[PDB]
RNA sequence: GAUGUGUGCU
DNA sequence: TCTGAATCTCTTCCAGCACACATCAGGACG
DNA sequence: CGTCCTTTCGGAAGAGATTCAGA
């Protein structure tokens, strides 16, 4: 459940990054195969990347570490 | 009066109007400014691009909606095209840079 | 895709290259078997096919044929879409102008040749002749001959040299034309000719030209050799309801000139003579100007039903343009609107969608998970489940529907606050329920208006409604500092019910042990609600690190206050809710649990709040009867004295005591104080009314009554309107305004008259015009208000600049209108402030003003303080983060990126429909006494006179602090002097207000210097005293002999020599305007600032802000001096006096034009300085600016309208006005070129010149000197770099020619641009969107 | 489909 | 007797939203 | 049918356009 987001704004220090944030995780949640890092409780795709950016165990920095570790991955894979 | 899609109109091809007609709500000029200062720039490009004039943009986000999926590939709302040819209609060249 | 839009003139091989066909027949479709023609409006082998993939003939039908073009019809296969995007020509027989490059006023045609438009409109339309290549005769280039003219040129120099007439020949002047070797002329004659209006001409005409040159246009592109369609379906033939085809006005227009066209082509092969022919091209020039711009013309012509039709000009502008209407604004899909009702059950997140509304919006998402949970095949299935509505759709939908919020608007969107995101709940019904507590900021009752709701669809749609559009999120206004989530008028009636105490109960000696035991006493009915009871109650406060510390009390309260305090959060202290809760208790009390407890606890608070106060009204069942507005016993006898003093000021009237404007004023006066009394009495009546007694003898208590609590909760109610209740209504007033001098004397309780009921309406329906009238006019406010500065947004985040205002607090001779610490919150210094402990520096140079530095600038007792103001960014394209402060809708410092200068117009133009539309000085406290700019003469009696206009009178607090500021006169006496404590309650400056004296400074004998009887002076003698009155005439009455001779009043010595004025070298000369009657007579001594001579001599609402913000000029302005130094008169009042400053150290090339209506405040021998007022009157914005500085205009405009805000009780930060302020400040005029490339008169932007001088700093060169202007709202948005922003604010037209002349290029930087285009708005998350995409070149 | 008229609600 | 300042015509705009009706080239010669 | 044809209850900026009255 999700009522206000000022521990995510908090978190992230802008609110318009934490928008574009959480947009990218929601859509990696949708789109792609990527299980949420929080146990959920039937929520949305939105709610669960907010709550995760509330936990802290998300922002840009480690959602940008995250992709280039997986594209590196894929890459040595690809041989 | 409710209203996911229906009809479009002719020259611009944005939702009609009234209850007659399956038609849309006008967001109007004056909510615009209320969405900018918001700073709600992708409300506002969904509003006047997907579930607008821009016809191409239109039936793919349609699609993506039932497709399981929440994204938008937006394009130039046709709208401006029809100003743009109003426009060239005169003796004006009115035209996009690269 | 692309970055930037170009926008010129259209050269014919352009028009050519359009085109994919020429249009020869002007003929739509046959009125057939529905098929386009051979080569009319519609036609299949130009634009493209009707059929999508088919061609026209039926030859080729499938997808495999595309690309192939027919043979028998020459159609090529393709999509039908074409035909919207593939233009048309038509060749035109005779050349033809572009009706706006002629009569845009100006005239790009008639400026270009530099002939009147009279005469290029004349040749245009076959009226008359010119001349072109004159040759070895007596006729120029520039000529223009009648036909007898033209028959004697011919006569006499019927040679191979050829004048004509229409558009061709005016074709052949601008080809003929170079544009180089006029350019090169012109400029020389500027820089020889002296001729101020010649020089504007000149550099208009320049501009013009260079402007020419450097874009790749050419001159004779305006004439239209070849005349572009548009696409048919563009222009489309709807079919009407029957055989007929729908009219359209550009189908008429277009047969109407290939008509005018083809009858031209049939005359020329056919040899016609030239007057018929002549004709022809004469109605071909007017059809294509109706056709290009209808109406611009004398006459427009009519289609059809006497109404002129829409040609190509009138679908570009206008509210009904492409601009306004498609492209600024759109219909929208996934939207409806329906009735909005309250449920009170919600949550402050929550809005209630009807079930049947929520289907039809949110159809896609259930179709899409109707496809993925194996319940359907495909979208039919889906479709046909939806649409019989199965038992399966609906827990579909309730999935759709958990969390993904939807936009709720009402219609006059006036703030953003009007849009709010908030959670759907599916109820049953048709109406939108909306929770009771966002109805305040949505300014939205339940009597019937509408709301519209809006489905965000993408995720990122979605957050941006969760994160920035939430109802939770919005608990603060953006305008100003203030709460918007109030209870209004339920909640706080039942918080004030609740939280009273009346002296009985059912217990009120018992002591109870908790708040859940007083719920429990009440409820079981042992205890009343307002008993007086001792709770044992535990409060927490978090004085530690974050850390809530519990302390237990046992407190005297009432059982409502600790049953109100079982909702109150952990760290709020108890006295919060042990008092009687008025809604600005309760709503200081949601604004204190914000700011200490944060955003959470306060929506779970509001939430609590609503509903205790929602339960404990209905509880209290607080009617209201007609037994309730109780009517003094005393009413009789007030209402009975007034009517016996009126008849007595009648009877004096009678016997002629008392004039007729005495008597009215008298009825008047004593009217309104029979009035008070009864108010008065009416009120003492209803506020202690209840007696009852204490189980002792007997007492009283606040009453009550019903209507009296419901207007002292503040719930709904005033003073006024329960006076019109239970008092009198009072004196009426006229349509005109006079107030009729008999007043309403009765009220709503016991009747109304017939006429007193008439009188009333007087005043009812001017106050209902009044706000019919007023939202037409605040609409367009802040419509410019947006369009002016709708581009600035916040893009650095600090600018480095040690600039700034003076922040101190308004002080307009009283009480203080708005304190140091309202007007410096939530702002960044500039410099260090100085504590009173000098040179010892209090706060440093880029803080934040939040209230521990404004509580730590009280206590220091600080009264100006220095602050970076938006007005002063060195910013280009916007505004830097500290040179704003706080964002006033969330506690920190503003974001970077994110748009003010909206914010800014709507916040000043949400209040518009609260405005309308239609001595001596007397110190009031203790403290010191201080006078700027002391210049000042000790009298004989023993007291001050002070001898300069600009002084101010402040009276000082014992701190050092400003507390009061007056304004002294000229030639007023003081009763005390500065620095001397003064006590409150007397008089220190007097003066008269008619009667301007010419007081002297030291004494001597007076001898009339150029002063006889009969030359300047008349015999007009004082009949009334007797003595002869020395009455120097004005400039009209008296003769030529006094002209010449100025009279003068020397302060001479026993000696009779000079007297030395001292700190200077000339003597006392002291020259006498007209008007000044001399009651001392020749040979008397004067005294030491004695009158020798005396001289006898606006809307604040709604339009006031309207022409602050559009910096209008004033009637009647005041005359300021430009420049300073001693000034005196030139010649004899040559139609108007001329006045001449002239300095102590520089030239005095400077003389103004002063008519005589004004009379000067300043005199012959003062010195004045630059700014300094020379006549009476509201100053225009303009010599503000360019006088007395930036800052002072900033201040003067800022000043003004929060004054015409604060009359209203309407609070707007300065912020806002601080940006507009600054986006009327753009322009800017060069002084001198420099080293830089920008024309002298030219007016370039400011940020242009910054930069241009910045880098030219840079290197050794120098850079350009730029004269700082101001607009209006309404000329700084038509003035901007980009010419999309002009054209669809306003002057469509008039922006689109001269951007097409000018070849002007649209960079796409701002807020509108993008909306136009379709793409990101650099605002939100677009600025990061657009700060990669800039960062990308 | 465009315009006009009128009513009404905000 | 050429020139800057004071009068003289013409341009533009005047908050948003639904909903009823009417009119859409048609007159006329061939 | 087929087909051709032709007034008038506004207020500001500003851009011609004239006048004036002065040297
Ligand atoms: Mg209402
Ligand atoms: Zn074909
Ligand atoms: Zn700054």
Redesign the pocket.
Same mark, same amino acid.
Request: proline residues 4%.
């Given at each position: 459940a999700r009522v206000t987001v000022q521990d995510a704004v908090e978190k992230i220090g802008n609110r318009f990054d934490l928008v574009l944030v959480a947009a990218r995780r929601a859509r990696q949640m949708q789109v792609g195969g990527k299980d949420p890092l929080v146990p959920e409780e039937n929520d949305k795709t939105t709610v669960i990347a907010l709550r995760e950016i509330e936990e802290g165990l998300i922002n840009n920095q480690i959602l940008d570490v995250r992709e280039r570790q997986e594209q590196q991955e894929q890459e040595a894979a690809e041989l | 009066?409710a209203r996911s899609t229906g009809?479009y109109?002719?020259?611009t091809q944005q939702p009609? *109007? *009234?209850?007659?007609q399956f038609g849309g709500?006008?967001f *109007?000029?004056?909510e615009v400014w209320a969405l900018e200062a918001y700073g709600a720039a992708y409300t506002l490009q969904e509003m006047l691009t997907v579930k607008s004039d821009d016809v191409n943009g239109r039936t793919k986000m349609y699609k993506n909606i039932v497709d399981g999926n929440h994204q938008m590939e937006p394009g130039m709302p046709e709208s401006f095209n029809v100003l743009l040819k109003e426009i060239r209609s005169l003796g004006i060249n009115i035209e996009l840079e690269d | 895709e692309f970055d930037a839009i170009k926008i010129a003139l259209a050269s014919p091989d352009m028009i050519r290259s359009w085109s994919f066909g020429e249009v020869k027949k002007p003929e739509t479709i046959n @009125?057939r078997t529905f098929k386009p023609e051979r080569d009319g409006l519609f036609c299949a082998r130009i634009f493209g096919p009707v059929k999508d993939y088919e061609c026209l003939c039926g030859k080729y039908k499938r997808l495999k044929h595309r690309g192939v073009i027919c043979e028998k019809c020459g159609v090529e296969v393709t999509q039908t879409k074409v035909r919207r995007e593939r233009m048309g020509h038509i060749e035109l027989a005779s050349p033809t102008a572009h009706i706006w490059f002629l009569?845009s006023?100006?005239?790009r045609i008639?400026?270009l040749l530099d002939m009147?438009?009279?005469d290029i409109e004349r040749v245009l339309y076959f009226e008359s002749y010119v001349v072109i290549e004159g040759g070895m005769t007596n006729l120029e280039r520039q000529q223009i001959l009648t036909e007898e003219q033209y028959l004697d040129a011919l006569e006499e120099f019927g040679d191979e040299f050829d004048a004509k007439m229409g558009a061709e020949a005016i074709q052949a002047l601008l080809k003929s034309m170079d544009l180089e070797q006029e350019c090169e002329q012109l400029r020389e004659e500027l820089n020889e000719? !002296?001729?101020?209006?010649?020089r504007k001409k000149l550099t208009k005409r320049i501009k013009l030209l260079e402007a020419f040159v450097q874009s790749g246009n050419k001159p004779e592109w305006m004439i239209l050799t070849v005349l572009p369609v548009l696409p048919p379906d563009l222009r489309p033939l709807?079919p009407?309801?029957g055989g007929?085809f729908?009219?359209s006005?550009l189908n008429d227009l277009y047969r109407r000139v290939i !008509?005018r066209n083809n009858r031209l082509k049939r005359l020329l092969d056919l040899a016609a003579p030239d007057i018929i022919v002549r004709n022809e091209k004469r109605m071909l020039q007017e059809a294509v100007d109706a056709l290009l711009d209808n109406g611009?013309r004398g006459r427009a012509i009519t +289609?059809? !039903?006497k109404?002129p039709l829409?040609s190509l000009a009138d679908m570009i502008? +206008?509210?009904?343009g492409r601009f306004?209407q498609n492209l600024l604004?759109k219909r929208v899909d996934y939207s409806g609107?329906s009735v909005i009702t309250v449920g009170p059950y919600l949550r402050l997140h929550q809005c209630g969608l009807p079930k049947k509304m929520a289907l039809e919006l949110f159809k896609p998402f259930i179709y899409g998970k109707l496809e993925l949970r194996g319940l359907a095949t495909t979208i039919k299935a889906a479709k046909k489940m939806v649409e019989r509505e199965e038992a399966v759709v609906w827990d579909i939908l309730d999935e759709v529907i958990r969390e993904h919020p939807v936009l709720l608007n #009402?219609?006059?969107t006036l703030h953003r606050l009007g849009i709010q995101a908030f959670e759907p709940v599916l109820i049953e019904g048709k109406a939108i329920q909306l929770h009771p507590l966002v109805c305040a900021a949505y300014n939205?009752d339940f009597?019937?208006?509408?709301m519209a709701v809006h489905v965000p669809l993408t995720l990122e749609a979605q957050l941006e409604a969760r994160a920035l559009m939430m109802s939770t999120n919005n608990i603060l206004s953006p305008a100003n500092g203030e709460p918007i989530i109030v209870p209004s008028q339920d909640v706080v009636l039942g918080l004030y019910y609740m939280t009273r105490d009346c002296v009985n109960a059912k217990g009120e000696g018992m002591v109870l042990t908790g708040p859940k035991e007083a719920e429990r006493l009440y409820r079981s009915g042992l205890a009343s609600l307002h008993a007086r009871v001792k709770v044992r109650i535990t409060e927490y406060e978090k004085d530690a690190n974050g850390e809530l510390v519990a302390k237990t009390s046992l407190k005297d309260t009432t059982v409502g206050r600790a049953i109100l305090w079982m909702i109150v959060p952990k760290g709020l202290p108890y006295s919060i809710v042990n008092q009687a809760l008025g809604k600005k208790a309760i709503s200081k009390m949601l604004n204190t649990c914000y700011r200490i407890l944060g955003l959470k606890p306060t929506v779970i608070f509001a939430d609590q709040i609503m509903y205790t106060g929602f339960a404990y009204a209905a509880r209290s069942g607080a009617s209201v009867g007609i037994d309730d507005m109780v009517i003094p016993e005393k009413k009789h006898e007030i209402i009975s004295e007034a009517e016996a003093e009126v008849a007595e000021i009648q009877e004096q009237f009678q016997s002629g005591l008392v004039t007729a404007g005495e008597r009215y004023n008298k009825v008047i006066d004593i009217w309104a104080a029979a009035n008070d009394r009864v108010s008065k009495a009416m009120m003492d009546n209803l506020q202690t009314e209840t007696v009852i007694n204490r189980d002792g003898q007997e007492e009283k208590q606040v009453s009550f009554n019903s209507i009296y609590m419901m207007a002292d909760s503040g719930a709904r109610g005033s003073a006024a309107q329960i006076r019109q209740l239970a008092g009198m209504r009072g004196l009426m007033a006229k349509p005109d305004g006079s107030i009729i001098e008999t007043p309403i004397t009765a009220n709503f309780r016991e009747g109304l008259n017939v006429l007193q009921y008439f009188i009333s309406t007087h005043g009812a329906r001017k106050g209902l015009a009044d706000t019919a009238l007023k %939202?037409?006019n605040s +609409? @367009?406010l802040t419509?410019r208000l947006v369009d002016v500065a709708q581009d600035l947004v916040v893009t650095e985040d600090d600018c480095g600049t040690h600039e700034g205002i003076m922040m101190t607090p308004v002080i307009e001779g009283g009480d203080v209108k708005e304190p140091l610490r309202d007007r410096v919150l939530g702002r960044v210094t500039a410099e260090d402030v100085l504590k009173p402990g000098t040179a010892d520096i209090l706060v440093p140079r880029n803080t934040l003003l939040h209230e521990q530095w404004c509580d730590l600038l009280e206590e220091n007792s600080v009264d100006a303080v220095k602050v970076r103001s938006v007005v002063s960014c060195d910013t280009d394209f916007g505004v830097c983060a500290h040179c704003y402060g706080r964002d006033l809708a969330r506690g920190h410092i503003i974001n970077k990126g994110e748009a003010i200068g909206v914010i800014a117009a709507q916040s000043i133009g949400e209040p518009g429909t609260q405005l309308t539309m239609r001595s001596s000085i007397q110190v009031k406290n203790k403290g010191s006494i201080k006078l700027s700019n002391v210049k000042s003469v000790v009298n004989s009696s023993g007291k001050l006179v002070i001898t300069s206009r600009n002084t101010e009178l402040k009276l000082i607090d014992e701190f050092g602090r400003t507390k009061e500021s007056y304004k002294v006169p000229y030639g007023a006496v003081l009763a005390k002097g500065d620095g001397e404590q003064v006590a409150g309650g007397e008089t220190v400056a007097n003066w008269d207000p008619h009667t301007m004296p010419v007081i002297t400074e030291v004494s001597g004998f007076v001898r009339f210097t150029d002063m006889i009887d009969g030359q300047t002076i008349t015999r007009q003698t004082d009949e009334l005293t007797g003595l002869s009155s020395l009455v120097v005439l004005d400039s009209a009455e008296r003769t030529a002999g006094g002209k010449d001779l100025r009279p003068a009043l020397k302060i001479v010595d026993a000696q009779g020599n000079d007297v030395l004025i001292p700190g200077t070298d000339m003597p006392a000369q002291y020259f006498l305007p007209g008007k000044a009657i001399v009651q001392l007579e020749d040979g008397v001594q004067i005294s030491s600032g004695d009158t020798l001579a005396r001289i006898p001599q606006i809307t604040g609402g709604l339009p006031r802000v309207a022409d602050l913000f559009?910096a209008? #000029?004033p009637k009647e302005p005041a005359i300021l001096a430009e420049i300073s130094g001693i000034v005196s008169f030139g010649?004899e009042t040559? +139609?108007?006096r001329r006045l001449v400053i002239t300095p102590v150290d520089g030239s005095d090339p400077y003389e103004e034009?002063i008519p005589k209506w004004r009379q000067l405040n300043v005199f012959e021998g003062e010195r004045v300085e630059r700014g300094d007022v020379i006549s009476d009157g509201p100053e225009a914005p303009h010599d503000i600016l360019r006088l007395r500085g930036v800052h002072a205009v900033t201040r003067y405009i800022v000043n003004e309208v929060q004054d015409v805000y604060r009359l209203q009780g309407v609070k707007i930060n300065d912020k806002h006005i601080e940006v507009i302020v600054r986006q009327m400040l753009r322009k800017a005029t060069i002084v001198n070129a420099g080293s830089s490339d920008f024309l002298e008169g030219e007016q370039v932007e400011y940020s242009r010149v910054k930069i241009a001088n910045r880098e030219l700093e840079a290197n050794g060169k120098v850079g350009a000197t730029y004269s700082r202007d101001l607009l209006?709202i309404t000329?700084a948005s038509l003035a901007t770099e980009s010419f999309i922003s002009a054209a669809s604010f306003?002057? %469509?037209? #008039?922006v689109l020619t001269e951007a097409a002349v000018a070849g002007k290029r649209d960079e796409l930087r701002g807020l509108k641009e993008n909306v136009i285009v379709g793409r990101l708005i650099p605002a939100g998350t677009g600025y990061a969107y657009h700060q990669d995409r800039m960062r990308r070149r």
């Open positions: - | 009066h009809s109109s002719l020259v009609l *109007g *009234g209850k007659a709500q006008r *109007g000029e004056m | @009125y009569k006023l100006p005239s008639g400026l009147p438009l009279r000719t !002296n001729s101020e209006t010649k709807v009407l309801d007929r729908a009219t006005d !008509n611009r +289609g059809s !039903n109404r829409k502008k +206008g509210k009904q306004r604004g609107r #009402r219609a006059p939205a009597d019937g208006d509408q %939202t037409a +609409g @367009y419509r559009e209008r #000029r010649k040559k +139609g108007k034009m209006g000329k306003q002057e %469509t037209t #008039r």
